Design a protein around this ligand. Structure first.
Ligand SMILES: OC[C@H]1O[C@@](CO)(O[C@H]2O[C@H](CO)[C@@H](O)[C@H](O)[C@H]2O)[C@@H](O)[C@@H]1O
Ligand SMILES: *[C@@H]1O[C@H](CO)[C@@H](O)[C@H](O)[C@H]1NC(C)=O
Ligand SMILES: *[C@@H]1O[C@H](CO)[C@@H](O)[C@H](O)[C@H]1NC(C)=O
Ligand SMILES: *[C@@H]1O[C@H](CO)[C@@H](O)[C@H](O)[C@H]1NC(C)=O
Ligand SMILES: *[C@@H]1O[C@H](CO)[C@@H](O)[C@H](O)[C@H]1NC(C)=O
Ligand SMILES: *[C@@H]1O[C@H](CO)[C@@H](O)[C@H](O)[C@H]1NC(C)=O
Ligand SMILES: *[C@@H]1O[C@H](CO)[C@@H](O)[C@H](O)[C@H]1NC(C)=O
Ligand SMILES: *[C@@H]1O[C@H](CO)[C@@H](O)[C@H](O)[C@H]1NC(C)=O
Ligand SMILES: *[C@@H]1O[C@H](CO)[C@@H](O)[C@H](O)[C@H]1NC(C)=O
Ligand SMILES: *[C@@H]1O[C@H](CO)[C@@H](O)[C@H](O)[C@H]1NC(C)=O
Ligand SMILES: *[C@@H]1O[C@H](CO)[C@@H](O)[C@H](O)[C@H]1NC(C)=O
Ligand SMILES: *[C@@H]1O[C@H](CO)[C@@H](O)[C@H](O)[C@H]1NC(C)=O
Lengths: 214, 181, 221, 304
């Protein structure tokens, strides 16, 4: 099958500046190439088809070029509503076996902002049900990349936590992240100090937030 | 000597079959030799008849040696003798198209009259019988009339037209209003 | 231009089949081709197949060939996608999409492979899990952080507001994670002035439509 | 080639196996040459319901350009040729010879107008299996060619003076067949499939559908220098080989040009019970055997 590859995976661009997105095909698809924009929770939106033709309702600042196996989408000056994920699609083959690239996420480049870190012990009500969830919150940081590690009695934890990250904030362009450590009530009561250690470009040294059970 | 009865506004399929299961040259004409429809190889042709806009066949049947004349939205004046000419052979069928309507499309009162009028093609001698929901039976020729409707006549009447030993059925919805004393 | 409206979310056990629909309004149906594209959580778009509506002929992606059928009902201007022998990895949002092909009724057909018009999407969750509402636990509190842990529900989605919609500033409701139990979990947090903790009451409102469950939870120091 | 002295041979162009043979040959040529992106064919009988056979395949854009075909004697047979310059194709031929092969015949597929064929040597000739039967196609063979120039940009041009001269000659021949007091009227196709209602042909590998109303709208024995026919190139077509639909890819050339010579026509007469002394003729065709018949009428195959 025809494999479509986009680069980079993530593009960080300051508001009002130019963005250039790349799409490569594993073989020639001529000019049968479309570009789509997709925002979180919405359907994709057609921007460009035939490699360079703007669809109706698409502003002139969007421009597609290329042919064969190499294509580019250029956004001349990024507006707030242009930050989104972009996909390329080839539709050159017959019988039809159309394929999409894996997307380029275009996000807002801002100055580095360290996270504010908070820790939440399990509630008494959840403890009553036999489970202990411990929540570590990293609030309003940039860039998105962060490292969170759980230590219980200074023992490094593995395989008992899950992270979730918000979409980029529409007002301040930051991200937030939760890490949740889950153990049974029994295991929870077998240890003393619960700590999440946060590593981030905005921090000189790793930040630790902790509590002792009870 | 085939006779087919049709209902005004409905669709009728007139059959024509060949000896072998293969697509060959066929043509439908009317009694005045006006061309209705036929084929040229794998293509449909339509002639300068009054049925032109409403005539068609089923090409998916031609390879099986069946060449129907399908007439949609039947009109009374479509009544005629139609001839299918296929492999040096003529298959004849007389189409008779009938229409049946009530005197009004509006709701009627108990004790009011209902008159049904059968629209017929020239030369036809149809007899009609209509039966209301309560079992009230009326029969006649061109016009059937009930003097006084009962509340129990409200609903679907069923009318059977008899022509050339064949029959066609019309259903007509009649509303008769209830009231309080 | 055509508007595409899809049918509602589906929840299926692995092995089941699903049939999703998409009603096309606003233009002449047979002049459009229609395509189904799906998107698994956190993943990209996957082309599933496309029907040449006027010809009633559909073509499918190789990886799905055999268990997918795309049909169209010209009488109701509706396009259907059926996916058989469902696997948990068939969990995705399924989009109906389409494009104008020219005066198809007069034999003009561009055979366009791009997609101009899109439906809103239909979530299809395929899982061994049974529908159930969440447990809601407090995440007790210059600036203070507090929240609600919304745990052990199925399927997606769940909706969260604070103080019946009167509080939106500083709120972060995280995307759900799928736990090893096959049940979803998320947290909703909000930062508020510390001085407020002793006067202003904070309630998270949690709505899970699939189980018709609704929970309000007061979060206190 | 070799004249048979004092031999009289009966010919029947309407029952000629050479026509059937050529037909099967051209069907094969097209099936191997012009492949549809999608092909849909009906399949019925059994259980009750009907079915549709669907084939999807690569459909390369190719420029179709007919090459002349020569038909030589099949093993065990001889080809006889009628030498009579004006022969109606059905009856005894007094001047007949044996030939090794037919002349070169370009297998042009089209409706309404016969293109790039052979001209009558003497006067215009009309042929039918039964002129009295309004349902039977009339094959017209011109004695003078008329250029028709078509472009993928959406039209065909024909010289109005030339076409009008042609019509007069055809009408004269038709009233010579149907009655000298007959008014001859030409009218547009009365309806049916697009491939039959329009002048339909293939040019540069594309299927053209040209509105021929302007060619068939005159009254005889009762304008502008160029007649310009509006045309449409289509991707979805009704196939001539059998009852199927095919879809082809859109054009890739921006300069599609063809210039052909009209050398004949396929007409049908309205007929019908009328005391009126006029005859109506409309462009016809569709059965490509008539196209082959227009060239093969003077040949037959006999057992040696
Ligand atoms: O049919 C699978 C086919 O689609 C591609 C891209 O066109 O990948 C899509 O589907 C994958 C599996 O569902 C997803 O993981 C991916 O994100 C999505 O784009 C090809 O990779 C694959 O051959
Ligand atoms: C018969 O036709 C041939 C042409 O093939 C011609 O040469 C010959 O003179 C004709 N015979 C007669 C009797 O004229
Ligand atoms: C054609 O053949 C006929 C006999 O069938 C003959 O009398 C006639 O001369 C021929 N036609 C012409 C114009 O030579
Ligand atoms: C065709 O010509 C032949 C003579 O070659 C003649 O016998 C026959 O009757 C003609 N047919 C018609 C209908 O003119
Ligand atoms: C063509 O035939 C017609 C009779 O149909 C005749 O009047 C005309 O002179 C002929 N033209 C030529 C070039 O022989
Ligand atoms: C010729 O056609 C007429 C008109 O339909 C018909 O009456 C006649 O039988 C036909 N002649 C032959 C020999 O088939
Ligand atoms: C058709 O084109 C030819 C050249 O190929 C030209 O000689 C002729 O005049 C044209 N005929 C028209 C436009 O009728
Ligand atoms: C052709 O048409 C002209 C008008 O365009 C008409 O006057 C004439 O009689 C017709 N005959 C010939 C041979 O041009
Ligand atoms: C051809 O053009 C004429 C005159 O404009 C029109 O009446 C007729 O319907 C057209 N025929 C078609 C579209 O086949
Ligand atoms: C038919 O021809 C007449 C004159 O011969 C002309 O006035 C009229 O416009 C034509 N009709 C069509 C449909 O082109
Ligand atoms: C059409 O015939 C004329 C006269 O014989 C000739 O000049 C021209 O080359 C021919 N055109 C084509 C396309 O065969
Ligand atoms: C007729 O022949 C000419 C010249 O050989 C060619 O260019 C043209 O394509 C032919 N027309 C058709 C429809 O085959």
């Amino acid at each position: 099958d025809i494999v479509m590859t986009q680069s980079p995976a993530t593009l960080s661009v300051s508001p009002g500046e130019r963005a250039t997105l790349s799409c490569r095909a594993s073989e020639s698809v001529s000019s049968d190439l479309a570009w789509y924009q997709q925002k979180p929770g919405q359907a994709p939106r057609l921007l460009i088809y035939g490699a360079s033709t703007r669809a109706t309702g698409v502003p002139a600042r969007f421009s597609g070029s290329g042919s064969g196996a190499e294509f580019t989408l250029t956004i001349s000056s990024l507006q707030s509503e242009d930050f989104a994920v972009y996909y390329c699609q080839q539709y050159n083959n017959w019988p039809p076996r159309y394929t999409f690239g894996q997307g380029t996420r275009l996000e807002i480049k801002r100055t580095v902002a360290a996270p504010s870190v908070f820790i939440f012990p399990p509630s008494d009500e959840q403890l009553k049900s036999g489970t202990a969830s411990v929540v570590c919150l990293l609030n309003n940081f940039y860039p998105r990349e962060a490292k969170v590690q759980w230590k219980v009695d200074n023992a490094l934890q593995s395989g008992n936590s899950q992270e979730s990250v918000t979409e980029q904030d529409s007002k301040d362009s930051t991200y937030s992240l939760s890490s949740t450590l889950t153990l049974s009530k029994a295991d929870y009561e077998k240890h003393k100090v619960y700590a999440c250690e946060v590593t981030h470009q905005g921090l000189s040294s790793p930040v630790t937030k902790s509590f002792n059970r009870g | 000597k085939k006779v087919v009865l049709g209902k005004k506004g409905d669709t009728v399929e007139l059959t024509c079959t060949a000896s072998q299961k293969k697509s060959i040259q066929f043509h439908w004409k009317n009694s005045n030799q006006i061309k209705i429809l036929g084929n040229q190889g794998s293509f449909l042709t339509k002639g300068p008849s009054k049925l032109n806009d409403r005539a068609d066949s089923r090409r998916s049947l031609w390879d099986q040696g069946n060449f129907p004349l399908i007439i949609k939205n039947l009109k009374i004046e479509d009544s005629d003798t139609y001839i299918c000419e296929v492999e040096d052979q003529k298959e004849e069928v007389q189409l008779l198209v009938f229409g049946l309507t009530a005197n009004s499309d509006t709701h009627l009162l108990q004790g009011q009259s209902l008159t049904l009028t059968l629209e017929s093609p020239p030369g036809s001698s149809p007899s009609v019988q209509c039966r209301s929901p309560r079992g009230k039976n009326i029969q006649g020729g061109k016009t059937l009339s009930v003097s006084q409707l009962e509340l129990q006549d409200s609903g679907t009447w069923t009318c059977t037209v008899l022509q050339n030993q064949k029959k066609v059925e019309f259903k007509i919805d009649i509303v008769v209003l209830a009231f309080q004393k | 231009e055509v508007q595409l409206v899809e049918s509602g979310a589906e929840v299926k056990k692995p092995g089941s089949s699903v049939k999703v629909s998409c009603k096309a309004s606003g233009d002449t149906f047979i002049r459009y081709s229609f395509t189904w594209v799906r998107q698994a959580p956190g993943q990209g778009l996957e082309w599933m197949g496309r029907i040449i509506t006027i010809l009633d002929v559909a073509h499918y992606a190789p990886h799905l060939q055999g268990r997918v059928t795309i049909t169209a009902d010209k009488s109701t201007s509706t396009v259907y996608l059926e996916l058989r022998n469902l696997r948990s990895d068939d969990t995705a949002v399924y989009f109906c999409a389409g494009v104008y092909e020219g005066e198809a009724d007069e034999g003009e057909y561009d055979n366009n492979g791009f997609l101009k018009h899109w439906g809103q999407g239909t979530l299809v969750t395929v899982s061994s899990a049974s529908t159930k509402g969440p447990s809601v636990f407090p995440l007790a509190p210059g600036t203070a952080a507090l929240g609600c842990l919304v745990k052990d529900y199925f399927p997606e989605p769940v909706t969260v507001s604070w103080n019946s919609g009167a509080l939106t500033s500083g709120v972060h409701t995280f995307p759900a994670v799928l736990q090893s139990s096959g049940l979803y979990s998320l947290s909703s947090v909000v930062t508020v002035p510390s001085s407020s903790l002793g006067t202003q009451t904070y309630i998270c409102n949690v709505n899970h439509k699939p189980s018709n469950t609704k929970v309000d939870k007061k979060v206190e120091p | 080639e070799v004249v048979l002295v004092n031999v009289t041979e009966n010919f029947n162009m309407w029952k000629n196996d050479m026509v059937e043979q050529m037909h099967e040959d051209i069907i094969s040529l097209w099936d191997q040459s012009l492949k549809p992106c999608v092909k849909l064919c009906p399949l019925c009988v059994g259980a009750g319901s009907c079915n549709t056979s669907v084939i999807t395949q690569a459909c390369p854009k190719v420029s179709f350009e007919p090459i002349p075909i020569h038909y030589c004697a099949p093993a065990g047979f001889a080809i006889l040729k009628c030498n009579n310059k004006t022969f109606n194709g059905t009856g005894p031929c007094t001047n007949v010879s044996t030939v090794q092969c037919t002349h070169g015949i370009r297998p042009v597929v089209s409706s309404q107008l016969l293109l790039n064929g052979s001209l009558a040597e003497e006067e215009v000739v009309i042929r039918s299996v039964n002129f009295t039967d309004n349902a039977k196609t009339i094959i017209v063979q011109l004695n003078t060619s008329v250029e028709i120039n078509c472009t993928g940009a959406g039209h065909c041009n024909i010289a109005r003076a030339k076409w009008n001269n042609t019509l007069k000659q055809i009408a004269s021949k038709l009233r010579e067949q149907f009655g000298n007091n007959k008014t001859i009227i030409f009218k547009q196709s009365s309806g049916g499939d697009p491939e039959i209602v329009t002048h339909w042909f293939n040019c540069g590998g594309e299927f053209f559908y040209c509105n021929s109303t302007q060619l068939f709208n005159s009254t005889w024995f009762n304008g502008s220098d160029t007649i310009t026919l509006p045309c449409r190139i289509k991707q979805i077509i009704n196939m001539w080989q059998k009852v199927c639909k095919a879809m082809y890819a859109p054009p890739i050339s921006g300069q599609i040009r063809c210039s052909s010579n009209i050398t004949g026509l396929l007409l049908t007469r309205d007929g019908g019970n009328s005391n009126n002394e006029s005859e109506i003729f409309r462009p016809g065709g569709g059965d490509m055997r008539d196209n082959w018949r227009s060239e093969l009428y003077k040949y037959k195959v006999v057992k040696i």
